[PDB]
């Protein structure tokens, strides 16, 4: 199957704090595997999955110095952004970044990513061609012009097409990660004239899953109530979906559960 690597970075300034807090989180196949936090005792990148303790001390020394550089870069950027948006002192501000690469099932690069957000809203992103920039805000045009003239995109293109792929390849070999947990499903019965039927999906990984209810071949959206997929806290996820049904005719309704770990979609009736 496909693979991916991502780094999610955040700098937050506050009035009572005199320097902003920088946090970087590394992801492989959407699972946290490194983290850095400037608030930490002695700020360093730390392994967040057992398979990363394989890396030697000089790996963590290099990553840590890179994070310290990112921290200074974010700090300067927050200051310039105050000017761009004519914001005064005395407020809280957020600068986020996402970057990384997607690989196909053949381990070839499908697409790179480099996006920034200020105050939680899109600020500037590198286009899929990895040569041009998209920026919506008028204030973000100042940045886009500066970056267009300085060949910043070439620098990021080299990372996304080179190191991001090379190191992801290495990470996948060092953890060859392919694990999926299939959903275990059951339907509960909630006599509310009616009863509510609630289809449960538990113990599944990854989080992506689809629950549907059917009456005589028709999927039922007539108030199919859900909850957002939620983590159990042990690495797996939970979810349920419910329908409003006339009492007595329970066996007319079936629940189906779709998930990439299943040999084929589940089909469930209340028993």
């Amino acid at each position: 199957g496909p693979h991916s690597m991502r780094y999610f970075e955040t700098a937050v300034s506050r009035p009572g704090l005199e320097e902003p807090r920088y946090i970087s989180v590394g992801y492989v196949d959407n699972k946290e595997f490194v983290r850095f936090d400037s608030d930490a005792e002695n700020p360093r990148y730390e392994p967040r999955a057992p398979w990363m303790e394989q890396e030697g001390p000089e790996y963590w020394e290099r990553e840590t110095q890179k994070a310290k550089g990112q921290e200074q870069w974010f700090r300067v950027s927050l200051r310039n952004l105050l000017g761009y948006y004519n914001q005064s002192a005395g407020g809280s501000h957020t600068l986020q970044q996402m970057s990384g690469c997607d690989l196909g099932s053949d381990w070839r690069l499908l697409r790179g990513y480099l996006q920034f957000a200020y105050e939680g809203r899109d600020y500037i992103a590198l286009n899929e061609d990895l040569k041009t920039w998209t920026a919506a805000d008028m204030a973000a045009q100042i940045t886009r012009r500066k970056w267009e003239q300085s060949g910043a995109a070439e620098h990021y293109k080299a990372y996304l097409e080179g190191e991001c792929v090379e190191w992801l390849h290495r990470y996948l070999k060092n953890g060859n990660l392919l694990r999926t947990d299939s959903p275990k499903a059951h339907v509960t019965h909630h006599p509310r004239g009616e009863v509510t039927l609630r289809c449960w999906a538990l113990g599944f990984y990854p989080a992506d899953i689809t629950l549907t209810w059917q009456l005589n071949g028709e999927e039922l959206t007539q108030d199919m109530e859900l909850v957002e997929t939620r983590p159990a806290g042990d690495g797996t996820f939970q979810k349920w979906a419910s329908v409003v049904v006339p009492l007595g005719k329970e066996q007319n309704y079936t629940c189906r559960v779709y998930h990439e770990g299943l040999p084929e979609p589940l089909t469930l009736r209340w028993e």
Binding site: A67, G69, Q70, Q97, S150, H155, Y159, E163, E166
Partner: peptide, 7 residues
């Protein structure tokens, strides 16, 4: 392998 932003 984290990135380093263009200075």
């Amino acid at each position: 392998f984290a990135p380093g932003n263009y200075p």
